[PDB]
């Protein structure tokens, strides 16, 4: 299932402090081409379609899309947009065609 692992989420925590901003670190695999309106969504575990996102951020692109060493990026979720319940959430990378290209382990805002 390498088609849904073309983006890898790095150093995801089990718990993010409620009320704080969250940095999401991701790595594009070697041959994956990110597009400008790709996005990282925060999804409650168990989601059926990408339209159930809790919140999202557009992808941070490297300015050098051909550099194999610039593949590690991050995006910052502001606390204002984040959940403050006890549900399990994960990061999902969704490309412009709506395909999930990566999914993280779950975490809670606790």
């Amino acid at each position: 299932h390498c088609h849904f692992s073309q983006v890898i989420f790095n150093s995801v925590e089990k718990f993010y402090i409620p009320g704080g901003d969250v940095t999401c670190h991701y790595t594009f695999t070697q041959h994956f081409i990110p597009r400008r309106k790709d996005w990282i969504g925060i999804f409650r575990v168990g989601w059926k379609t990408t339209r159930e996102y809790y919140t999202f951020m557009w992808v941070t692109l490297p300015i050098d899309l051909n550099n194999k060493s610039a593949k590690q990026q991050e995006v910052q979720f502001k606390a204002y947009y984040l959940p403050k319940d006890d549900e399990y959430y994960q990061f999902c990378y969704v490309d412009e065609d709506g395909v999930v290209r990566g999914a993280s382990i779950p975490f809670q805002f606790r």
């Binding site: 299932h1 849904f4 089990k14 999804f43 575990v45 168990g46 989601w47 059926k48 379609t49 399990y88 994960q90 999902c92 395909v99 999930v100 999914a103 993280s104 382990i105 779950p106």
Partner: protein, 43 residues
């Protein structure tokens, strides 16, 4: 018909089941520690 959503949930289930196993291992160690303390304190 896409299976991406299923893959995402497997990723999550895989990690929660690992956290469950670790949490149960730690609880077993906490019970051992309690037993040691109770043997020391309650005779």
């Amino acid at each position: 018909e896409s299976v991406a959503s299923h893959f995402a949930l497997v990723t999550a289930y895989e990690d929660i089941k690992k956290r469950l196993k670790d949490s149960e291992k730690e609880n077993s160690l906490l019970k051992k520690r309690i037993r040691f303390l109770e043997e020391k304190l309650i005779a």
